[PDB]
Swiss-Prot record, chain A:
It is found in: Cytoplasm. Pfam families: Guanylate_kin. The keyword Kinase applies. One of its GO terms (cellular component) is cytosol. Keywords: ATP-binding, Cytoplasm, Kinase, Nucleotide-binding, Transferase. Its main location: cytoplasm. This is Guanylate kinase. ATP binds at A9, P10, S11, G12, A13, G14, K15, T16. Essential for recycling GMP and indirectly, cGMP. GO terms for molecular function: ATP binding; guanylate kinase activity. It catalyses: GMP + ATP = GDP + ADP. SUPFAM superfamilies: P-loop containing nucleoside triphosphate hydrolases. InterPro entries: GK/Ca_channel_bsu (IPR008145), Guanylate_kin-like_dom (IPR008144), Guanylate_kinase (IPR017665), Guanylate_kinase_CS (IPR020590), P-loop_NTPase (IPR027417). It comes from Pseudomonas aeruginosa (strain ATCC 15692 / DSM 22644 / CIP 104116 / JCM 14847 / LMG 12228 / 1C / PRS 101 / PAO1).
Amino acid sequence: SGTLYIVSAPSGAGKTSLVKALLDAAPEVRVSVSHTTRGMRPGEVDGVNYHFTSREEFLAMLERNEFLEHAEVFGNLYGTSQRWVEKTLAEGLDLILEIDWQGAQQVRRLMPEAQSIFILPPSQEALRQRLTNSDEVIERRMREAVSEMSHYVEYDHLVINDDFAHALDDLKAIFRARQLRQDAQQQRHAELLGRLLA
Amino acid sequence: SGTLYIVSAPSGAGKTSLVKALLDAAPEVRVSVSHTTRGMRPGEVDGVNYHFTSREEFLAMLERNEFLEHAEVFGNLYGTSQRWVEKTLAEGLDLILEIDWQGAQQVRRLMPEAQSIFILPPSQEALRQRLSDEVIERRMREAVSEMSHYVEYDHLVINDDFAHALDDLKAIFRARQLRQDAQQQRHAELLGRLLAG
Ligand SMILES: Nc1nc2c(ncn2[C@@H]2O[C@H](COP(=O)(O)O)[C@@H](O)[C@H]2O)c(=O)[nH]1
Ligand SMILES: Nc1nc2c(ncn2[C@@H]2O[C@H](COP(=O)(O)O)[C@@H](O)[C@H]2O)c(=O)[nH]1
């Protein structure tokens, strides 16, 4: 079966260009499309950026136990649907959940073999620029981002996004090393290992 | 302090070209020079490939508890001197022990924070070349016989294509430096600034 990767970053900027770039260079890796109850933004496509749904429909899915994890982020509900994750892993494909620290905690309990990565800004100034890209609102968004970053200690690996080219290669190294671990290689090269041992 | 890496292969696939190439691209990483009692081979230099010594002197060193690990391989004795390992790690340098599965077990027992990598051939045919025609068969039988110890290693690298295997090794070393503990030490000041309110 495939490997599950959790990738988290401060939520105020949206999903990271780093993960998009990683997926562009490794088309065999899949990414989960989350459900959300927030409204669509210009340039977003239902079924691609998110499965956009209603709060009533989101809660009904929760009652039907369809979410691997869910969380409230800035008052809107987000979640990872479980069936798609199980299907993709069972096909032997690796996949990424780009989710916040709350969802990461839930996933780790259910899947202790999951690799998790937190992507950090190089400075508060750089984080603030990404958020501003109203002043009063900005400081609250910064305080909320700081509270999320405090959870970086819960993650297996950390990437400091100082130089985009360097951070992308750092992500690639984490993913490649994960696939070289004993557990993944034993399954991947099962037939080879049998020939080496017989 | 530095990280200790154990790099192993089936017994007889000696000090690998892969590790040398990795060291060329990793100037902060050192490699331990092993002691051996086998005779020098053409092109080998005492103090570089090995510390070549006698069996009686090897046993005297063993009696003085100077070896972190030691093992018999094809009837010859090999070992890692402990003082150099401790000094190198305490200087903050990473280091590689290129040793067999027996030495790996001893090092894991004494230093559970050590990380380990097993380098696998793509086939038995490929292993045979790397290993007298009779001498080749004795090395092949021993290497195949103890192949199962790959399961004890943290990562596995298939040495099919040299460049691909080298990139695999590099990714393992880089991922270790991206681990929570290494990054917390590297970015302590930054992390404190990010969390300060
Ligand atoms: N737990 C959880 N968090 C999510 C999920 N999808 C997105 N998020 C988080 O919600 C944040 C806000 O996303 P945005 O509204 O900008 O698209 C993201 O930065 C990410 O941290 C999800 O399925 N589960
Ligand atoms: N335990 C242990 N094995 C070693 C050491 N140095 C070399 N070896 C093993 O001895 C094998 C034979 O090496 P060679 O004699 O061809 O140079 C190597 O493939 C490696 O498995 C050492 O210091 N300790």
